[PDB]
Amino acid sequence: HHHHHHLANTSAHDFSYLKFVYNATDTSLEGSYDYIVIGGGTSGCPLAATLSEKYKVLLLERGTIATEYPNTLTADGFAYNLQQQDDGKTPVERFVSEDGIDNVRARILGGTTIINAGVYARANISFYSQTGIEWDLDLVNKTYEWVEDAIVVKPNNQSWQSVIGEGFLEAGILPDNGFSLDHEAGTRLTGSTFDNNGTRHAADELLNKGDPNNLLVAVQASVEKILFSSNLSAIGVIYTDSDGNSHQAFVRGNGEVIVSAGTIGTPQLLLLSGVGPESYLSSLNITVVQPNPYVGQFVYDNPRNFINILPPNPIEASVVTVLGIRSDYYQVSASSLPFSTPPFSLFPTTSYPLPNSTFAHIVSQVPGPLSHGSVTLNSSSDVRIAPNIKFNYYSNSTDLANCVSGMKKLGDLLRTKALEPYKARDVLGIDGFNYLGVPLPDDASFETFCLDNVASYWHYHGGSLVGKVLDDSFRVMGIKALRVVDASTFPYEPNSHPQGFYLMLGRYVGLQILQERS
Ligand SMILES: Cc1cc2nc3c(=O)[nH]c(=O)nc-3n(C[C@H](O)[C@H](O)[C@H](O)COP(=O)(O)OP(=O)(O)OC[C@H]3O[C@@H](n4cnc5c(N)ncnc54)[C@H](O)[C@@H]3O)c2cc1C
Ligand SMILES: *[C@@H]1O[C@H](CO)[C@@H](O[C@@H]2O[C@H](CO)[C@@H](O)[C@H](O)[C@H]2NC(C)=O)[C@H](O)[C@H]1NC(C)=O
Ligand SMILES: *[C@@H]1O[C@H](CO)[C@@H](O)[C@H](O)[C@H]1NC(C)=O
Ligand SMILES: *[C@@H]1O[C@H](CO)[C@@H](O)[C@H](O)[C@H]1NC(C)=O
Ligand SMILES: *[C@@H]1O[C@H](CO)[C@@H](O)[C@H](O)[C@H]1NC(C)=O
Ligand SMILES: *[C@@H]1O[C@H](CO)[C@@H](O)[C@H](O)[C@H]1NC(C)=O
Ligand SMILES: *[C@@H]1O[C@H](CO)[C@@H](O)[C@H](O)[C@H]1NC(C)=O
Ligand SMILES: *[C@@H]1O[C@H](CO)[C@@H](O)[C@H](O)[C@H]1NC(C)=O
């Protein structure tokens, strides 16, 4: 298959880039650069590597390097990082939305690709025309291949993923797409950023494609403020190191500051810097640099709804590789060992029953979603104090209708011959399964189930939307030399699993920056 000749193979996680990674305590990192990228995450790492092909780049990341937390480097360690308590330095930062749903974000060089579930997919090909951005579609595809050559494999067979795939097909999630990276209706094996040795590959490895003479990375660099000219332009940043001391770095000439701090971090930093809704910022006595009513608005979290089955015989743990895709729901299942310490946010609250045997977590994702909320500041000065985030799950009735459809399809899945061997009782109904937590239930019972048992899919996005805060080149409207590139930029998903899109986007926008400059 020509289209997959380029995929990565099994290999150790490549930390060669550590040769140009430095502690933010090093004041010799202060000074002038062509580009400053804020946030060494999913988009930020390939963006910085791409810009460094020609220009001097400083990448600033608030977390440390992944070697400090070895359980981020294997598939087997996924649960560990979520189970670990948040001490302010760990790679997983815990939060709770104002809705009451537990959640996490990354705090580590590599961003959320260092802690995530590894599922790799390209964007739904209809996404590009939906946005109305004049994408260079040939370049988009070359850029996917540049990412995939470094960190994406074709997964080997896993017994539970194959069971689930046979079930999806039997339940009518057709056609059978075989192995494919593309987000299309039907059932498929997709790519993974875990290799077939279980080694995690991630966005930090794309730093190895940067020019080591041009790229500098500062870790434990907490960026507190974007600095502006006194024609409004961004000119630099203030960041603090792990000892608390402050540092300043600037861009020069035709260079630019790009914010890649994520759905949560990018609106927070813009607001702290005086870019945002005029009445809101004035009410905090933050001087407004650029009024924009949409900074931190239109923030989205696709709902996750789920059931857990406890088979009467052990099943093998698996990472998610098999996807069942419809336009109105995206479905997967993971199989897991039992645990006595919960992975935080796997279930939506800390008071959720613990599994004492192996279990299958069977999941459906609402597309969009159409419900939205906001990011607002908790502290008007301290970037290390997490902002308030509210998603307003199921405020839009279309989301609820789509959850009902997805839950009914999970019922179909539980009724397949594929899943029958995992029932505890060989009775006709799906009550023959043993359930951890709430089992599946007319639509009123499904609506109640959807509302009561919702969790985060962890695929939140928005807050600095193209068309509201940014133009089609990802520039902050009204401000020269300032862009935003990360998941804050779009109001809908590109697909069921967006890391592949945001990895591509980092390099793609970097190439656009370089081309505009030439
Ligand atoms: C638990 C979990 C599992 C997931 N699993 C999958 C999956 O299997 N497949 C998939 O496709 N997607 C998955 N996702 C979603 C996907 O990984 C994310 O949507 C995507 O990685 C977000 O990229 P980003 O660049 O917007 O943010 P990030 O990758 O989080 O990058 C933002 C970076 O900015 C840093 N930062 C923030 N504020 C500052 C500041 N002030 N100064 C300096 N640095 C700062 C952060 O530390 C972070 O490294 C998962 C998400 C989670 C939470
Ligand atoms: C791929 O993305 C497109 C969005 O651009 C989705 O298609 C739209 O949504 C529904 C599809 O049932 C229709 O009402 C719209 O008319 C569609 N628009 C276009 C231009 O086709 C589509 O559902 C997504 N596909 C998957 C499998 O998620
Ligand atoms: C993976 O192995 C194949 C074997 O055909 C090889 O051609 C390719 O160069 C390897 N991929 C990478 C990214 O090194
Ligand atoms: C940076 O140096 C400080 C000491 O000044 C130390 O406490 C911290 O762990 C270092 N961080 C990294 C990422 O090396
Ligand atoms: C890009 O790749 C996709 C598959 O991911 C393919 O369907 C599409 O035709 C390609 N587009 C271009 C412009 O090559
Ligand atoms: C803002 O400052 C004014 C004084 O100029 C004060 O009256 C007001 O209470 C302040 N508001 C906040 C939220 O600090
Ligand atoms: C800050 O967040 C906490 C939740 O962690 C909340 O209880 C508190 O009211 C918030 N404070 C402000 C000023 O927003
Ligand atoms: C739900 O979302 C759609 C699309 O954004 C919108 O047209 C509709 O008005 C929303 N419904 C409600 C009740 O807000």
TrEMBL record:
Disulfide bonds join C403-C450. Its cofactor is FAD. It catalyses: (R)-mandelonitrile = benzaldehyde + hydrogen cyanide. Residues 106-129, 262-276 form the Glucose-methanol-choline oxidoreductase N-terminal domain. FAD binds at T42, S43, E61, R62, T112, N116, A117, G118, V119, V223, W458, H459, P498, Q499. The active site is at H459, H497. Keywords: Disulfide bond, FAD, Flavoprotein, Glycoprotein, Lyase, Signal. Its EC number is 4.1.2.10. PROSITE patterns: GMC_OXRED_1 (PS00623), GMC_OXRED_2 (PS00624). Substrate binds at Y457. GO terms for molecular function: flavin adenine dinucleotide binding; mandelonitrile lyase activity; oxidoreductase activity, acting on CH-OH group of donors. It comes from the Eukaryota. Belongs to the GMC oxidoreductase family. Monomer. This is (R)-mandelonitrile lyase.
